[PDB]
Each structure stands twice: as structure tokens, then as C-alpha cells.
Amino acid sequence: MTLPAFKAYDIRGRVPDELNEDLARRIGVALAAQLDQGPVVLGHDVRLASPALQEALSAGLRASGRDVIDIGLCGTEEVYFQTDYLKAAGGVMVTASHNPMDYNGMKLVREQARPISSDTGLFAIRDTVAADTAAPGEPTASEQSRTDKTAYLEHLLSYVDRSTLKPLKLVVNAGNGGAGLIVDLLAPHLPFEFVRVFHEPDGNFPNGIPNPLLPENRDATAKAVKDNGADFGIAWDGDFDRCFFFDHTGRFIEGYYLVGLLAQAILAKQPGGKVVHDPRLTWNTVEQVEEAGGIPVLCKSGHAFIKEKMRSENAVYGGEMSAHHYFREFAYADSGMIPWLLIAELVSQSGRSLADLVEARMQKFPCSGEINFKVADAKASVARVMEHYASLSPELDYTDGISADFGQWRFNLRSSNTEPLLRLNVETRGDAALLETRTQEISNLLRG
Numbered sequence: 001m002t003l004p005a006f007k008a009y010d011i012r013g014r015v016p017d018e019l020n021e022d023l024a025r026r027i028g029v030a031l032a033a034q035l036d037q038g039p040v041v042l043g044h045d046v047r048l049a050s051p052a053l054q055e056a057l058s059a060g061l062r063a064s065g066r067d068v069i070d071i072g073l074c075g076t077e078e079v080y081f082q083t084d085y086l087k088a089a090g091g092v093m094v095t096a097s098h099n100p101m102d103y104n105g106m107k108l109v110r111e112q113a114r115p116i117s118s119d120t121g122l123f124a125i126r127d128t129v130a131a132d133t134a135a136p137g138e139p140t141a142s143e144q145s146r147t148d149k150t151a152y153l154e155h156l157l158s159y160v161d162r163s164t165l166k167p168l169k170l171v172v173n174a175g176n177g178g179a180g181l182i183v184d185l186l187a188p189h190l191p192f193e194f195v196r197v198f199h200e201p202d203g204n205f206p207n208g209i210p211n212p213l214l215p216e217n218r219d220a221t222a223k224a225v226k227d228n229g230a231d232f233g234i235a236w237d238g239d240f241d242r243c244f245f246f247d248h249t250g251r252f253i254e255g256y257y258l259v260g261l262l263a264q265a266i267l268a269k270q271p272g273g274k275v276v277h278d279p280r281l282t283w284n285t286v287e288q289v290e291e292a293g294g295i296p297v298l299c300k301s302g303h304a305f306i307k308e309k310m311r312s313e314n315a316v317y318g319g320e321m322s323a324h325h326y327f328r329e330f331a332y333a334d335s336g337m338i339p340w341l342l343i344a345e346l347v348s349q350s351g352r353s354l355a356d357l358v359e360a361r362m363q364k365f366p367c368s369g370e371i372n373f374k375v376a377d378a379k380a381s382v383a384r385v386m387e388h389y390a391s392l393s394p395e396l397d398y399t400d401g402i403s404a405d406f407g408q409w410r411f412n413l414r415s416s417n418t419e420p421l422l423r424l425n426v427e428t429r430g431d432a433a434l435l436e437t438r439t440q441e442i443s444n445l446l447r448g
């Protein structure tokens with residue numbers, strides 16, 4: 001077999017049988033052989049074992065003659081930003097944010113923070129590590145500590161006109177991940193009043209592993225919004241490359257609707273741009289992008305595909321319904337910080353609440369939410385769905401699984417690239433009844 005920690009998009013496994021300091025050192029050696037010239041940026045998340053894994057990575061890299069730029073405890077987006085900003089040969093973020101307590105991982109990028117994925121270097125690294133029985137060399141390169149966040153913070157603040165911001169009251173919930181450290185560095189330069197929930201970084205995660213999608217975790221942010229009369233709330237995953245929004249009523253806003261909203265926010269600053277979106281939920285994004293004079297570009301889901309498509313299109317912005325938002329000048333990469341700054345500015349300038357910014361769009365294009373299925377035979381289940389609907393002759397697109405457009409309703413059905421599951425999304429043209437009957441019909445077919 002092969003080392004199971006090497007997945008399609010990153011490295012992820014239980015410590016210490018699937019990921020440990022010796023593997024991390026070997027990964028550093030192998031990474032050095034996979035990159036063009038230059039130093040390598042390293043950072044890590046709040047998990048207790050993360051520093052030691054980073055240090056082993058550094059030892060392997062420096063044994064291979066790579067200078068290391070240690071950016072410290074950070075978010076994943078800071079590894080992306082510093083790798084590109086400093087013109088480094090690549091970067092590694094030590095994190096496996098959503099996984100259980102005994103798990104860690106690594107996200108790897110090359111020049112300009114371009115992803116290293118299974119077919120673009122990661123499995124080459126895996127195979128080198130797998131066969132590497134050499135004794136560890138000693139370091140022949142240096143490590144520098146570079147914890148200055150000025151250029152990163154200035155980049156974040158460039159997405160808003162400070163003089164137009166109003167003193168909104170914002171709930172922020174880092175979930176004991178790392179997001180609060182950036183919020184607090186930004187706060188002196190913003191007029192907002194922050195209500196800080198689960199704010200201190202704690203790798204023991206006393207309030208649960210950060211995952212705002214779990215209803216119990218979602219409810220902590222919703223309660224804080226309602227109880228404090230906040231204008232909106234923001235929660236993050238642990239490495240804070242994903243952001244999650246709650247309007248003033250406490251209602252969680254499905255990520256689908258933020259894609260169109262953020263696209264309009266960016267198109268106001270960069271008119272006529274191309275906007276990359278995924279195939280799971282589309283109609284609202286296409287309409288809002290075109291209404292704002294942008295050009296929507298359909299792309300397979302998954303951060304590496306989004307980024308490569310954005311690059312080829314000079315796209316100003318990309319958005320996935322899975323809470324990932326990508327910005328051209330941010331190394332074409334995803335940020336959990338840029339989106340809430342943009343939303344705070346929209347609310348400030350428009351005088352409209354976040355609820356009003358999305359309400360009509362949610363009524364116009366209601367969606368199922370992503371529904372996941374572990375079935376005995378994914379291929380037979382997909383075929384059962386398609387055969388059932390054949391007599392209606394949907395328009396079919398195979399960008400990412402199967403997308404079927406029936407006119408007043410559509411669905412996307414695909415296999416996950418990170419887990420052995422099928423993922424379903426359905427939306428309709430303003431018809432909540434059709435949404436529910438079709439969702440339940442597909443569900444029954446998949447479970448058959």
C-alpha cells in the first residue's frame with residue numbers, strides 16, 4: 001500500500017502512526033527536491049503537536065540546503081500570502097483543522113503559493129518519502145524568524161475604504177483557533193465594536209474542534225449575535241481559511257449566497273472582471289455576477305482547480321459554496337479575513353443589513369444545503385438517480401460529477417475528493433416545495 005496520510009489536496013493523518021516527526025523531516029527533504037529555487041515559508045496552527053512537526057519539516061528542508069522562513073503561529077492564508085509576497089520557492093502550513101484531536105497535517109504550496117496536490121507533486125513527495133531510507137543529514141542552510149504581519153495586514157485593509165466604515169457591532173468566534181489574533185491586530189484600524197467569543201487560541205479546544213457547521217458550534221455564534229444585538233457574526237475554522245456568516249437575527253447564511261454577494265463587492269472595485277464559481281450551486285452566482293458586469297466562469301470544485309482557473313482567466317475573485325473565497329491580488333488564494341471586511345463595508349456603505357443583502361436571493365434560488373451520502377455502491381446509486389430522471393431529458397454537464405438542469409430545478413451529484421462519500425446539492429427557481437420533493441426523491445433513490 002501507500003502512506004495513507006497523503007490525500008488528494010494535502011497531508012492529513014493521526015499522530016503518530018500516520019504522521020510524526022520522522023515523516024515530517026522526510027517530507028521536508030522530499031519537498032526540497034520538488035521546488036524551484038528559493039527559501040521555504042513555514043507556519044503552523046494552534047494544535048499542540050504543530051510546532052514539533054514544523055521543526056522537523058525545517059530540519060529536513062535545511063539538511064537539503066533550503067533556507068527556511070519561519071512565520072510562526074499563523075493562519076493557512078498567511079503561509080499562502082507570505083510565500084507569494086516574499087517570492088519564496090514554496091511553503092508549508094502545519095494544520096489539519098477540522099480533524100479529531102489526535103490528527104495533524106500539512107498543506108503544501110510552491111512558487112506564488114500555487115497548490116501542490118496529489119497529481120502536481122504531492123504523490124511524488126509521498127513516493128520519495130516512502131522509499132527514503134537515508135540517514136538524516138545535518139543542516140546546511142539557515143532559518144530566519146519573520147513574524148512581521150505588516151504587509152499582510154496592509155493587504156487585508158486595502159479591501160476597504162476605512163473612511164466609509166460604520167461602527168458596526170460584530171460577533172467574532174475563532175472557536176479557540178487562530179483567527180482572533182488577526183482580528184485583534186486589525187481592530188485598532190477599524191471602527192467596529194467586537195464581541196469576542198471563544199477567542200483565545202487553545203489547542204486543547206475546550207469548546208470543541210472549530211467547525212462552525214456543526215449545529216452546536218453554529219448556535220454559539222447565533223446566540224452571541226442575538227444576545228448582543230450585533231449587526232452580524234463571523235466564525236472561522238481553526239486555520240481560519242474558511243469564514244461563516246450570521247445575520248442580525250442569528251441565522252446562518254448558506255455559503256452559496258456569499259459567492260454572489262462577494263463577487264458584487266469585488267466587481268465594484270475591479271469592474272468587468274471574471275469570477276470563478278463551482279458547479280454545485282450556480283444560478284444565483286451567474287445572475288449576480290452578470291448583473292454587476294462581471295463574467296462568470298464555471299470550474300470544478302476544489303481549491304486547486306479554482307486557483308488554476310482563476311490564474312488562466314485573470315479572474316478577480318473565486319467563490320465556492322463550501323466557505324472558500326479567493327482573491328486575485330491575494331496570491332489567487334483563499335482568505336477567511338478578506339470576506340468579512342468586504343461584508344462589513346457593504347453593510348456600512350449600503351445601510352442595508354446582511355439579512356437584507358441576501359434575503360431576496362435566498363427566496364429566488366433556494367437550495368438544499370449540501371447533503372452527504374455514504375452508500376454501499378456509489379456508482380449504482382448515481383445510475384439509479386439518472387435512470388429515474390431520464391424521461392424528463394435534463395441538460396447534463398460533467399464538469400464535476402453530474403449536473404442536471406431540468407428548467408425550474410437542477411442538481412449536482414458528485415464524489416468527494418477528500419472522503420469516500422457522495423455529495424448532493426439541489427436548487428430551484430423560487431420554489432421551496434419543488435426543492436423539498438426533489439431533494440427527498442433523490443435522497444430515497446441514493447439510499448435504495
Ligand SMILES: O=P(O)(O)O[C@H]1OC[C@@H](O)[C@H](O)[C@H]1O
Pocket residue numbers: 096097098099237238239322
Ligand atoms: O480542515 P480544514 O483544512 O480546515 O478544511 C478542509 O477540510 C474540511 C473541508 O470542509 C474544508 O473545505 C477543507 O478546506
Ligand SMILES: O=P(O)(O)O[C@H]1OC[C@@H](O)[C@H](O)[C@H]1O
Pocket residue numbers: 301302303304320322324415416417418419423
Ligand atoms: O470533499 P470535497 O467536496 O471534494 O472538497 C471539499 O474540500 C475542499 C474545498 O475546496 C471543496 O469546495 C470542498 O467541497
Ligand SMILES: [Mg+2]
Pocket residue numbers: 076097237238239240241242
Ligand atoms: Mg481550514
